[PDB]
Amino acid sequence: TMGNSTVLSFCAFAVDAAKAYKDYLASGGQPITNCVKMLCTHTGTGQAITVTPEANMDQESFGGASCCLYCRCHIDHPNPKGFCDLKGKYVQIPTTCANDPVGFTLKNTVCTVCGMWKGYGCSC
Numbered sequence: 001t002m003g004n005s006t007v008l009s010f011c012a013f014a015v016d017a018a019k020a021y022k023d024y025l026a027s028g029g030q031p032i033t034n035c036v037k038m039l040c041t042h043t044g045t046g047q048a049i050t051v052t053p054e055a056n057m058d059q060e061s062f063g064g065a066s067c068c069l070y071c072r073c074h075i076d077h078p079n080p081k082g083f084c085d086l087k088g089k090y091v092q093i094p095t096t097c098a099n100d101p102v103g104f105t106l107k108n109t110v111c112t113v114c115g116m117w118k119g120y121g122c123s124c
């Protein structure tokens, strides 16, 4: 275990920060920790990204910015306006993936229909 600061610094200065973290995880690297876990009833909508925590019984809720590689690396977000979908919001992570919220949000996409993670919560 090399530490959050070491992993984030290594990814932050890579030309592709997302690829750097994914390659690190694929090599057996310990996931980034110290994400902000929320106290909640697990009775929520189960939508992926929300104004308040919305974990259902299959999810954990976290502070959005703490689970965002770009926020955690202090670098620009990969879109023209550099907007963050996670900052100031709460992200619902499947309990099976909640050991690596940064990796989960990086690798996954929200169903534009039901607002749940494609391949997980989404049953469209």
Ligand SMILES: c1ccc(-c2cnc[nH]2)cc1
Binding pocket: 006, 009, 010, 013
């Ligand atoms: C060992 C220790 C630190 C690092 C590093 C930190 N930021 C970039 N590389 C790389 C290997």
Ligand SMILES: c1ccc(-c2cnc[nH]2)cc1
Binding pocket: 042, 056, 057, 058, 059, 060, 095
């Ligand atoms: C503490 C209490 C309950 C839970 C939980 C319930 N369903 C998923 N996680 C997680 C932490």
Ligand SMILES: [Cl-]
Binding pocket: 004, 005, 034
């Ligand atoms: Cl830390």
Ligand SMILES: [Cl-]
Binding pocket: 046, 059, 092, 093, 094, 116, 117, 120, 121, 122
């Ligand atoms: Cl989900």
Ligand SMILES: [Zn+2]
Binding pocket: 065, 068, 069, 070, 071, 072, 077, 084, 085, 086, 087
């Ligand atoms: Zn962000």
Ligand SMILES: [Zn+2]
Binding pocket: 111, 112, 113, 114, 115, 116, 122, 123, 124
């Ligand atoms: Zn869906």
